[PDB]
């Protein structure tokens, strides 16, 4: 072949819908996940990628372990985003909930609706995952949020929003998929 080690790829999936897709630690790698121009597309990840990015969706699902540096989200609505990671990133967002633990603090821009909630996800290899990065399952600022969008109120800015205790729960089970 030409080369063997060197520099980080890159690979993902896009233009999909309504389509599955699932990969495991020996597939990824350590790798960055580009996922754009998709809709009902629901990605059950399962290891430790390099860096997550999810931007132009809709409608999708996304579930993977605690990310390595952090993810992006940008272009997404109605979707749900489900990763821990150290710092969140998100830009001309509305309507999409995105469920994880940050360690250090979360930024938002010129988006309106936004959910942030705790990270909460089983696994044979859930906690174990978090070893990997190195990244603590207590310590989280979620309810810390940077806003970038004032000018009528005077009190807060109606960007970001914390979700009740009634729909924690999300019945991922369809019925004939069991995991």
């Given at each position: 072949g030409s080369s063997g080690s060197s520099g980080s790829w890159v690979c993902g999936f896009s233009n999909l819908e309504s389509q599955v897709l699932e990969k495991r630690a020996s597939e990824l790698h350590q790798r960055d996940v580009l996922l754009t121009e998709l809709s009902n597309c629901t990605v059950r990840l399962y290891g430790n990628p390099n860096t997550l990015r999810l931007t132009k969706a809709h409608s999708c699902k996304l579930l993977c372990g605690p990310v390595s540096?952090?993810?992006?989200?940008?272009?997404?609505?109605?979707?749900?985003?489900?990763?821990?990671?150290?710092?969140?990133?998100?830009?001309?967002?509305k309507d999409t909930r995105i469920f994880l633990q940050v360690t250090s603090r979360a930024i938002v821009e010129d988006c309106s609706g936004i959910q942030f909630a705790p990270y909460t996800w089983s696994y044979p290899e859930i906690d174990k995952d978090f070893e990997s990065s190195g990244l603590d399952r207590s310590k989280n600022n979620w309810n810390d949020v940077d806003d970038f969008n004032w000018l009528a109120r005077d009190m807060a800015s109606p960007n970001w929003s914390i979700l009740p205790e009634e729909e924690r729960n999300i019945q991922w089970d369809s019925g004939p998929s069991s995991g």
């Amino acid at each position: 072949g030409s080369s063997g080690s060197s520099g980080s790829w890159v690979c993902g999936f896009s233009n999909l819908e309504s389509q599955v897709l699932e990969k495991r630690a020996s597939e990824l790698h350590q790798r960055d996940v580009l996922l754009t121009e998709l809709s009902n597309c629901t990605v059950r990840l399962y290891g430790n990628p390099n860096t997550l990015r999810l931007t132009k969706a809709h409608s999708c699902k996304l579930l993977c372990g605690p990310v390595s540096t952090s993810v992006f989200l940008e272009d997404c609505s109605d979707c749900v985003l489900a990763v821990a990671c150290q710092q969140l990133r998100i830009h001309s967002t509305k309507d999409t909930r995105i469920f994880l633990q940050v360690t250090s603090r979360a930024i938002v821009e010129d988006c309106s609706g936004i959910q942030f909630a705790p990270y909460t996800w089983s696994y044979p290899e859930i906690d174990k995952d978090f070893e990997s990065s190195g990244l603590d399952r207590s310590k989280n600022n979620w309810n810390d949020v940077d806003d970038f969008n004032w000018l009528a109120r005077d009190m807060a800015s109606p960007n970001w929003s914390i979700l009740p205790e009634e729909e924690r729960n999300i019945q991922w089970d369809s019925g004939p998929s069991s995991g």
